[PDB]
Design an enzyme around this catalytic site. Structure first.
Site, PDB file in Angstrom:
ATOM      1  N   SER A 100     -14.008   0.662   3.021  1.00 43.90           N
ATOM      2  CA  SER A 100     -12.818   0.070   3.544  1.00 43.90           C
ATOM      3  C   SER A 100     -12.990  -0.349   4.969  1.00 43.90           C
ATOM      4  CB  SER A 100     -11.718   1.139   3.350  1.00 43.90           C
ATOM      5  OG  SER A 100     -10.566   1.123   4.192  1.00 43.90           O
ATOM      6  N   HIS A 125       0.762  -1.255   0.000  1.00 44.94           N
ATOM      7  CA  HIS A 125       0.000   0.000   0.000  1.00 44.94           C
ATOM      8  C   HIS A 125       0.789   1.300   0.000  1.00 44.94           C
ATOM      9  CE1 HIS A 125      -3.777  -2.191   0.572  1.00 44.94           C
ATOM     10  NE2 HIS A 125      -4.345  -0.989   0.668  1.00 44.94           N
TER      11      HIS A 125
HETATM   12  S1  SF4 Z   1      -8.842  -2.150  -3.520  1.00 39.18           S
HETATM   13 FE1  SF4 Z   1      -7.547  -1.866  -1.601  1.00 39.18          FE
HETATM   14  S2  SF4 Z   1      -6.163  -3.780  -1.699  1.00 39.18           S
HETATM   15 FE2  SF4 Z   1      -7.112  -3.624  -3.763  1.00 39.18          FE
HETATM   16  S3  SF4 Z   1      -5.609  -2.604  -5.172  1.00 39.18           S
HETATM   17 FE3  SF4 Z   1      -7.010  -1.002  -4.281  1.00 39.18          FE
HETATM   18  S4  SF4 Z   1      -6.132  -0.187  -2.385  1.00 39.18           S
HETATM   19 FE4  SF4 Z   1      -5.056  -2.170  -2.951  1.00 39.18          FE
END
Ligand code: SF4
EC number: 4.2.1.3
Length: 753
Positions: free
Chosen positions: A641, A100
């Site tokens: 999230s 990330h």
């Molecule tokens: S949805 Fe969350 S885990 Fe998936 S690529 Fe995007 S930021 Fe990364």
């Protein structure tokens, strides 16, 4: 039974399908009815199959997950809470994935080198805490957490939890993979039962087969437009039907992944021959062979009952593009050109982005390359900017080897590091001024306000990777790949043929460079160092225990109007820098939420000073002066999230309760975990009775009880009071978290002192 290891990295941890079988059989003896596939895997992982009360939508199940996976933006605060527990070692297989914090700017290797320099403190903290507590560590550059899990850790019948709301991705290989906040991961790493409200089951029957331009992403773009972002709440989505065998294993993972955008607990597909195939090509033929012997327990029982059924005919499905600021505004690609025009959405596409965990597989890269070689054969290149994120090192190495990466470079794309990147706003974007209205199209999943580039007027549309490639070559939303003509270099009009590509490499996968780091399971006498002057990491101080009294004369910090996502409550992008520092990240608290008083983001009235100011600053002022406060929200509060920072930050800045019409599941659990009161209106029209100026008393905390509502006295300025009732979904385990100050405080009381 058989001794088949859970993965190549844990040769001694065996798959327990015998255990699964045993528990399914105890439970089906009690229930005397067909079980869906999700019920088999979930109830087969019960801590007490003989005594557990099982009612869909009603009881809390005490489960035993098989493994825990964390990514580096959430692993920091999960490991700082694990360090407060004082426990020496994690109890189940656990991994950290560093994906990330790599910012896109220069592309590939250059971006990775820079992130290793910039984020050294954090990567060091996670590798060390990993070595000490026995957690496997996948180094930066290894890939996006979900692609590494599908490739190495997800198998049929696993119950896996992950600190990331797109952990459902693993349902593409037949397991139940559920998104949780860091405090829930701590429970399981600590060895105590994990609790989950027994889900409803939505069955989606797939019929026909995909053809042409339609791809697995269209199935879930259509389901989201049907169910809406709150339609899956409290349920697992279970795909079944003859059309299932028409979809590749990573295609199934795409559909399960984006089930997150309708609020579903997770999504799953039954074990079939495409999964078997993917297991064999990823070095796990012995696991496919064992799942074949246990196949009965890995498909739904004949005639099982779904609480809702939706049927989609894959043969009639057309290419979709969803957005702009919700993932459930669904349009066929053939009409987005005209709806945009009508709605004032910018038509010229600035950037086309393929990747994220939803669409970064070998097959997605092959299908995008297939569109791109056609453009190249006519002497064309992208009119829009075009970025490409490979989902893992193995996929980057193999698409490089099989020729797809070079085609994509030749049409004008920049290959980014194997990381989230522009998907959580880790993108150094400079082609637009801030506040400039513009359109980008992605093969991602969420497209919430300012999430990719912190610009609120960026209009982001999510679609399939081959449609991003076609629209990036045309550079306008007014292009339908199915019908319309491009003009080659040579002067001729030509049409894009539908992409065809292999689902998996014909040769084996090239694994790429080494990126896993096993724990010393010997040494483990690492000291984890957190500098006391660090701006990025800070050890936690425990929250206060409940004082035994009701909450009187609470100040309303903000009454939010509308959609309030966890990106509105605790933004990502630049704030990811502080995910290990609670006081520093608390400076983004609720800065995106719209205040009903003035319809402004980050501008609320300070009750004492009568000045309008930032929300974080006003909460700190009330905290500084002993004023306990409350947030009043609307429907589906906490959508998005799983980041527990949206619950830790209001607790740190003096918040006591969050009263809404409804909550998204993971945020509501994170709120109870941090000792806050998530309460809903017994009558949602009561949201209209509460004005910013009113003070509230929550009464009856002394005999707080499962199923009994709480009385809220609204005190109006003129002396008028009004009592309303507020519901909660606390069982007695959770009321203990509240009384102790948090779940972590409660766990520490159970450690006999
Ligand atoms: S949805 Fe969350 S885990 Fe998936 S690529 Fe995007 S930021 Fe990364």
């Amino acid at each position: 039974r058989a001794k088949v290891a859970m993965s190549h990295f844990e040769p001694h941890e065996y798959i327990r399908y015998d255990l699964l079988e045993k528990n399914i059989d105890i439970v089906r003896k009690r229930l005397n009815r067909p079980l869906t596939l999700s019920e088999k895997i979930v109830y087969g992982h019960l801590d007490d199959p003989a005594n557990q009360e099982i009612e869909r939508g009603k009881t809390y199940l005490r489960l035993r997950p098989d493994r825990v996976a964390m990514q580096d933006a959430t692993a920091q605060m999960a490991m700082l809470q694990f360090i407060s527990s004082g426990l020496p070692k994690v109890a189940v297989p656990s991994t950290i994935h560093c994906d990330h914090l790599i910012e896109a700017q220069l592309g590939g290797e250059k971006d990775l080198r820079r992130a290793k320099d910039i984020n050294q403190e954090v990567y060091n903290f996670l590798a060390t805490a990993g070595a000490k507590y026995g957690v496997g560590f996948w180094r930066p550059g290894s890939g996006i957490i979900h692609q590494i899990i599908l490739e190495n850790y997800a198998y049929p019948g696993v119950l896996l939890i992950g600190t990331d709301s797109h952990t459902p991705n693993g349902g593409g290989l037949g397991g139940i993979c559920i998104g949780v906040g860091g405090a829930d991961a701590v429970d399981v790493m600590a060895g105590i039962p994990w609790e989950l409200k027994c889900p409803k089951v939505i069955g989606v029957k797939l019929t026909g087969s995909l053809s042409g331009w339609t791809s697995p992403k269209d199935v879930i773009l259509k389901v989201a437009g049907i169910l809406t972002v709150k339609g899956g709440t409290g349920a697992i989505v279970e795909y079944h039907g003859p059309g299932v065998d028409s979809i590749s294993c990573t295609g199934m993972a795409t559909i399960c992944n984006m089930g997150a955008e309708i609020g579903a607990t997770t999504s799953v597909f039954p074990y079939n021959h495409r999964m078997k195939k993917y297991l064999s090509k990823t070095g796990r033929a012995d696991i496919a062979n064992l799942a074949d012997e246990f196949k009965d327990h890995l498909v739904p029982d004949p005639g099982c009952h779904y609480d809702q059924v939706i049927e989609i005919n894959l043969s009639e499905l057309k290419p979709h593009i969803n957005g702009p600021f919700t993932p459930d505004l669904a349009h066929p690609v053939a009409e987005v050109g005209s709806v945009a025009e009508k709605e004032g959405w910018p038509l010229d596409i600035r950037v086309g982005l393929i990747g994220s965990c939803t669409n970064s597989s070998y097959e997605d890269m092959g299908r995008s390359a297939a569109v791109a070689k056609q453009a190249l054969a006519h002497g064309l290149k992208c009119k829009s900017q075009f970025t490409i994120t490979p989902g893992s090192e193995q996929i980057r190495a193999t698409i490089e080897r099989d020729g797809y990466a070079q085609v994509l470079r030749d049409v004008g794309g920049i290959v980014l590091a194997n990381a989230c990147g522009p998907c959580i706003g880790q993108w150094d974007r400079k082609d637009i001024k801030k506040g400039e209205k513009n359109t980008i199209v992605t093969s991602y999943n969420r497209n919430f306000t300012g999430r990719n580039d912190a610009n609120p007027e960026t209009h982001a549309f999510v679609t399939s990777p081959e449609i991003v490639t076609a629209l990036a070559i045309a550079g306008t939303l007014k292009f339908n790949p199915e019908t319309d003509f491009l003009t080659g270099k040579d002067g001729k009009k030509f049409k894009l043929e539908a992409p065809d590509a292999d689902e998996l490499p014909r040769a084996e996968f090239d694994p790429g460079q080494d990126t896993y780091q096993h724990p010393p399971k010997d040494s483990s006498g690492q000291r984890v160092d957190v500098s006391p002057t660090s701006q990025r990491l800070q050890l936690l101080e425990p929250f206060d225990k409940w004082d035994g009294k009701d909450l009187e004369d609470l100040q309303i910090l903000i009454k939010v109007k509308g959609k309030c996502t966890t990106d509105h409550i605790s933004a990502a992008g630049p704030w990811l820098k502080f995910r290990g520092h609670l006081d520093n990240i608390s400076n983004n608290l609720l800065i995106g939420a719209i205040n009903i008083e003035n319809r402004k983001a980050n501008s609320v009235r300070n009750a004492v000073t009568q000045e309008f100011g930032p929300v974080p600053d006003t909460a700190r002022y009330y905290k500084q002066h002993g004023i306990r406060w409350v947030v009043i929200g609307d429907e589906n509060y906490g959508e998005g999230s799983s980041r527990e920072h949206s619950a830790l930050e209001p607790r740190h800045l003096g918040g006591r309760a969050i009263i809404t019409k409804s909550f998204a599941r993971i945020h509501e659990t994170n709120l109870k975990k941090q000792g806050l009161l998530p309460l809903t209106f017994a009558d949602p029209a009561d949201y209209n009775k509460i004005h910013p100026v009113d003070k509230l008393t929550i009464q009856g905390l002394k005999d707080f009880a499962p199923g009994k509502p709480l009385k809220c006295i609204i005190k109006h300025p003129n002396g008028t009071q009004e009592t309303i009732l507020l519901n909660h979904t606390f069982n007695e385990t959770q009321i203990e978290w509240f009384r102790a100050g948090s779940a972590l405080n409660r766990m520490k009381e159970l450690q006999q002192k």
